[PDB]
Design a protein around this ligand. Sequence first.
Ligand SMILES: Nc1nc2c(ncn2[C@@H]2O[C@@H]3COP(=O)(O)O[C@H]4[C@@H](O)[C@H](n5cnc6c(=O)[nH]c(N)nc65)O[C@@H]4COP(=O)(O)O[C@H]3[C@H]2O)c(=O)[nH]1
Lengths: 97, 241
Amino acid sequence: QGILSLALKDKAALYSAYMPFVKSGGIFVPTPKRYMLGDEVFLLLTLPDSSERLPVAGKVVWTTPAGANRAAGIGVQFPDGPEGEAVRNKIETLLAG
Amino acid sequence: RWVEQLREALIGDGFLLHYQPVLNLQGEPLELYQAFLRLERNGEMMSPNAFMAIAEEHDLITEIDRWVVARAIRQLGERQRAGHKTHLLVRIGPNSFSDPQMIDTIREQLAVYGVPGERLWLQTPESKVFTHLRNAQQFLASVSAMGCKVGLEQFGSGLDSFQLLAHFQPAFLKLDRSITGDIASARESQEKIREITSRAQPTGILTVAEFVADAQSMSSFFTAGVDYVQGDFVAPTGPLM
Ligand SMILES: Nc1nc2c(ncn2[C@@H]2O[C@@H]3COP(=O)(O)O[C@H]4[C@@H](O)[C@H](n5cnc6c(=O)[nH]c(N)nc65)O[C@@H]4COP(=O)(O)O[C@H]3[C@H]2O)c(=O)[nH]1
């Protein structure tokens, strides 16, 4: 419903959650709600480091139904620009180790 | 015989097209949609954004370009047999400016379905057109001879925009969002949109404002003289029609 929240607990969960083959980088967010492609959502992310929530205003570029695998959700591509490079960097420099 | 070609028909999922209706304002009424590429796969849907990077490094870019324009002409064909006369805006990468197979496809397809060229509107980013002026200029020439309309998207915020217009002389323009999001409150945008709007009309270049989400914006575009508008506030994107 516009405002989504995703908290990850460890490099592994972030590894399976972090989509890197996307443009500005992406993160898969589990939701049983019906989001359509292009949706501009606001995701409050929390990485394995600290419990600080990072603001991410992205677009829905991937939808899943959890059919006949992987929970059902949406893939949010990070905002083009500085604020995207920030979340994408924080993540890469985390999974790297 | 037929059998082997029939067995082929057992077609699965892959690329398909969704559409966004483009509405009237100052312009002439006409069934106009923008086609957006998509990829269906065992339940999931994908925006090109999620796969154009891998395409970019293997250069499927041009083939997926041709596939799109062809499916466009096709859809344009069915909508005619159904007696509709629909127009379609298709995004096209500069990679297709030099590609010959693109012209040939547009020509073949366009004839296959007996659809006039005026029904196909090819849009390309302004930024890419002057980095590739020549190839872009001959693509315009070739395509225009079949009757297709070519225009510039993301047009308006550069130091040499107005001079491209006089030079490239496109059929239409899709105003940059850097000018379109602001209009309800930005004086700079309100004037710039009018500046662009006044250089287009005398020649008949169609103006388009995309990603529109307000009533205010709608009203500001109308007055400024925009011919068409797209966005969530106007209409969603889907297979619809
Ligand atoms: N709810 C909502 N959603 C919005 C809004 N603004 C944009 N979006 C969504 O975000 C995506 C980005 O569109 P784009 O900026 O034109 O960026 C395009 C474009 O760069 C690329 N692309 C797709 N087809 C082609 C093509 O044939 N040629 C080229 N060169 N690029 C293409 O893929 C991207 C994806 O396009 P789409 O699939 O249509 O998915 C769109 C759209 O559904 C909004 O205000 N509200």
